[PDB]
Design a protein around this ligand. Sequence first.
Ligand SMILES: Cc1ccc(-n2nc(C(C)(C)C)cc2NC(=O)Nc2ccc(OCCN3CCOCC3)c3ccccc23)cc1
Length: 326
Amino acid sequence: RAGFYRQELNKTVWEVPQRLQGLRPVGSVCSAYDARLRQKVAVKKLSRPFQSLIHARRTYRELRLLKHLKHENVIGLLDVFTPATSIEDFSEVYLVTTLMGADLNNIVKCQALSDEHVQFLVYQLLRGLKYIHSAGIIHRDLKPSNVAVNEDCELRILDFGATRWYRAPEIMLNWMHYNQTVDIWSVGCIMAELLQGKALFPGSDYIDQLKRIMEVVGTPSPEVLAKISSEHARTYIQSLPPMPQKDLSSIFRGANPLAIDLLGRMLVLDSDQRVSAAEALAHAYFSQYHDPEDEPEAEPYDESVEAKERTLEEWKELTYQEVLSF
Ligand SMILES: Cc1ccc(-n2nc(C(C)(C)C)cc2NC(=O)Nc2ccc(OCCN3CCOCC3)c3ccccc23)cc1
């Protein structure tokens, strides 16, 4: 509280340095202008970050993860702080980034994007995911509202923290050994929505979700169904009647043939045959944007520290160090 000040936004106290002016709650997340940095910034006050062990891990990970990942099309930390002068009164954490404007829903709602815009939006989303995947990280909840877009159509991936719309089958079916391509399914659901201007699989429940996915992508073979689901989850799919595969061209009428082609390589039930984030950029849909040189990978993410049992006070202190060291 040495140069900080207190408000109440979202009916909760917000202690921040005085450089941050004019907090308008977005969602807790608030807008603001930074006086020193002289630009628009967003701020994320973490909810009771050290009340529980899990909160302490999630508080640590988020911080560790945003610091590690540094890419154009990914969220990046401008600043981190606490209103705490010691480890005793360390109870609150605040993360700070650039204001990216709106989410991806706003763009679709307001303006039906051309095939030119769509090319550039998915390009960035893959180029960004290529970075994250290369780090050895999975989003597991890629969706419109976890993707910010600047007015220049600049894109950035984030994790705010329905989902099932853009969720891969094997996650719903509890495969428990799913890899990075779960997100590639999500990208397809997002990209399809960009074209049509409406959700591809707006399932009203768990079953209805699967019934919509099984109509377009069709019924999987018993061989393919056995490698994307637990023994218990299979009875949900077998319950459903036999439904044939639909040709995407008939769905996405008057779409770019290339765009339809790429969706066929993303919306696949077998994860082994889904396209890679890296491969997908090579596709002729992004021929206007693809640059092999300017599509960097990320550094391997060290799990070592996290992959170890510790008490709260250790997560508390470990975090304090990571805050201050920024
Ligand atoms: C426990 C936990 C662990 C990790 C994460 N996590 N994982 C990722 C990956 C997938 C990209 C690596 C990113 C994040 N964390 C985030 O993306 N955090 C945030 C989300 C939404 C926000 O504000 C959104 C509001 N607004 C949108 C428009 O642009 C300005 C911000 C934020 C505002 C300021 C600071 C951080 C924010 C999240 C939680």
